Amino acid sequence: AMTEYKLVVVGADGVGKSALTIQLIQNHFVDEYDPTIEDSYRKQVVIDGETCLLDILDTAGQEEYSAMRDQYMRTGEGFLCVFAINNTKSFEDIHHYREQIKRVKDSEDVPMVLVGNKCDLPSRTVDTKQAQDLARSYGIPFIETSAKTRQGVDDAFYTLVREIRKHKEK
Numbered sequence: 001a002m003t004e005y006k007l008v009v010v011g012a013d014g015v016g017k018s019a020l021t022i023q024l025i026q027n028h029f030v031d032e033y034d035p036t037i038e039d040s041y042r043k044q045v046v047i048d049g050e051t052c053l054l055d056i057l058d059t060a061g062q063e064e065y066s067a068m069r070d071q072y073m074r075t076g077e078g079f080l081c082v083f084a085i086n087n088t089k090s091f092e093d094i095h096h097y098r099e100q101i102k103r104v105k106d107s108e109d110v111p112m113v114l115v116g117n118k119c120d121l122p123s124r125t126v127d128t129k130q131a132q133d134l135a136r137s138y139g140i141p142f143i144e145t146s147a148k149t150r151q152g153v154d155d156a157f158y159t160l161v162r163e164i165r166k167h168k169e170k
């Protein structure tokens, strides 16, 4: 049987969560994917010769807390925490997303990757030092992505899978 990995993509509206997920699954860049659609997508990919079936939750919608949303997020094995390099507020928000993951996982050691998306854009307000300092504080990898050019997309998802394996057997 394939090995299943439950991945969850989190961050502010507009950072590129859907664009990154669609690049991974469909190998194209979507300009305008409905900002309100939250769904789980499946990708079969071989990583270090293991056939993986990724279950990727592309988050969306309102800021709502419930036992049922808590429990859904608790089943996540690994999280991509995405901000956009031209969105200071999305970066500032990362501490909150990590706090919510740590709360439902009741752990400081949750497989996570910090993803700085939209690296193709010229209007950079979050410098790489800010990103690297935050990831080092959390003890997690940082990787710059462009969903537009596809730079870093495979790297972000494969690295998260490897972080999950390092944490737990699969």
Ligand SMILES: C#Cc1c(F)ccc2cc(O)cc(-c3ncc4c(N5CCC[C@@](C)(O)C5)nc(OC[C@@]56CCCN5CC(=C(F)F)C6)nc4c3F)c12
Pocket: 010, 011, 012, 013, 059, 060, 061, 062, 063, 064, 065, 066, 069, 070, 073, 092, 093, 094, 096, 097, 098, 100, 101, 104
């Ligand atoms: C996301 C998320 C999330 C986790 F990563 C882990 C466990 C969670 C448990 C929960 O019950 C709920 C969530 C969750 N759901 C939605 C969430 C959501 N919305 C609106 C912005 C776009 C969206 C896709 O992130 C959905 N937004 C926020 O925080 C939004 C901010 C901005 C305005 C004030 N909020 C707090 C904040 C800071 F910086 F203090 C960021 N968190 C969510 C959340 F924790 C969990």
Ligand SMILES: Nc1nc2c(ncn2[C@@H]2O[C@H](COP(=O)(O)OP(=O)(O)O)[C@@H](O)[C@H]2O)c(=O)[nH]1
Pocket: 011, 012, 013, 014, 015, 016, 017, 018, 019, 020, 030, 031, 032, 033, 034, 035, 117, 118, 119, 120, 121, 145, 146, 147, 148, 149
């Ligand atoms: N230039 C550029 N635009 C992007 C990138 N990723 C997403 N976008 C655009 O930013 C907007 C929001 O992306 P979306 O994936 O809908 O964000 P989400 O709200 O986090 O799902 C869309 O117009 C995307 O085309 C990227 O890496 N570079």
Ligand SMILES: [Mg+2]
Pocket: 017, 018, 019, 033, 034, 035, 036, 037, 058, 059, 060
């Ligand atoms: Mg989206």
